Amino acid sequence: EYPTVSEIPVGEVRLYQIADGVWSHIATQSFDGAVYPSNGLIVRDGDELLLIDTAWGAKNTAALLAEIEKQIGLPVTRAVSTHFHDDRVGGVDVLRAAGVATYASPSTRRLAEVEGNEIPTHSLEGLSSSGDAVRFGPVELFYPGAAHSTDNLVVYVPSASVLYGGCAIYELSRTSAGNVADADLAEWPTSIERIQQHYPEAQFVIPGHGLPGGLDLLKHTTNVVKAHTNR
Ligand SMILES: Nc1nc(C(=O)O)c(CCc2ccccc2)s1
Ligand SMILES: [Zn+2]
Ligand SMILES: [Zn+2]
């Protein structure tokens, strides 16, 4: 079964096999007085691993590398952060110290610098406009436009029809927006529509936080978003 927030002590990381050569990683961290789970992705890249997002902090991210080495045993050589918040770039310095080449869009790297967060080393070209997609090893990176954040990316694994929505996609059970301080509430439904249009075949959809679902998570998130927008 997919691991839940209460089953993961802060500082520990679980891996979950979604498909051949595709895992999510699950960690937990405190924010504003409560503890939340957070998802990232791991994808086999030939003889190497591509990492999508940190495990939300330096300590969790170190535990992530240890768990990858224990359970999979291939080297993590590249990492992509899908926006500038700490559940995506917090731990980048650990990754870099461990030998991992870290990447993000120019906009994410800039927003991280402005925020005082950790800054991935390398800039990803070709994602500056809503609807842009680029290939990055075994995944496609896609900028759907502003949503949870202005810089947020989603990731698609064609080999397994796995769509990683990051924090622009909410889990089914989540019915309130919570904190959306950096969100573009007006653009977010349009951005989810681009995701739907571009990955109509997705079979597994992983939100940034919580339980995986299917394409139903997109409409679900749009419903939550405008509700918070509708009063
Ligand atoms: N770093 C973090 N991002 C987010 C986010 O919204 O992207 C957090 C709130 C997530 C949440 C809320 C309710 C239930 C389960 C999870 S915390
Ligand atoms: Zn975020
Ligand atoms: Zn988040």
Of 64, 99, 105, which Cα lies nearest the Cα of 84?
A: 105
Of 24, 32, 27, which Cα lies nearest the Cα of 58?
A: 27
Q: Which two tokens stand for residue 174?
A: 């989540």
Collapsed DSSP state (helix, strand, coil) of residue 177 = coil
CA 194/CA 60 separation, integer angstroms: 32
Of 65, 164, 78, which Cα lies nearest the Cα of 120?
A: 78
Q: Residue 90: which residues within 8 A CB-CB, separation 6 or more? A: 54, 56, 57, 58, 61, 117, 118
Q: Which two tokens stand for residue 126?
A: 């070709």
Residue 181 DSSP code: T
End-to-end Cα, the chain, rounded Å = 36
CA 35/CA 60 separation, integer angstroms: 13
Rg (CA), the chain: 16
Ligand with minimal distance to 83 CA: 2
Residue 175 DSSP code: -
What are residue 134's phi and psi, to 5 degrees? -135, 155
Q: Which two tokens stand for residue 100?
A: 């991992």
Q: Count the residues in the chain.
A: 231
Q: Residue 70: which residues within 8 A CB-CB, separation 6 or more? A: none
CA 49/CA 51 separation, integer angstroms: 6
Ligand 3 centre from 87 Cα, in Å?
6
Pairing label, strands 122-123, 14-19: unpaired
Determination technique for this entry:
X-ray
Pairing label, strands 154-157, 139-142: antiparallel
* Residue-range domain boundaries for the chain: 5-230
Ligand 1 centre from 91 Cα, in Å?
18
The answer to whether 26 and 37 have CB atoms below 8 angstroms apart is: yes
Question: Looking at the domain that runs over 5-230, which CATH code has it been given?
Answer: 3.60.15.10
In which order are the strands placed within the sheet that holds 204-209? 133-136, 139-142, 154-157, 162-170, 204-209
Ligand 1 near 167 CB (within 6 A): yes
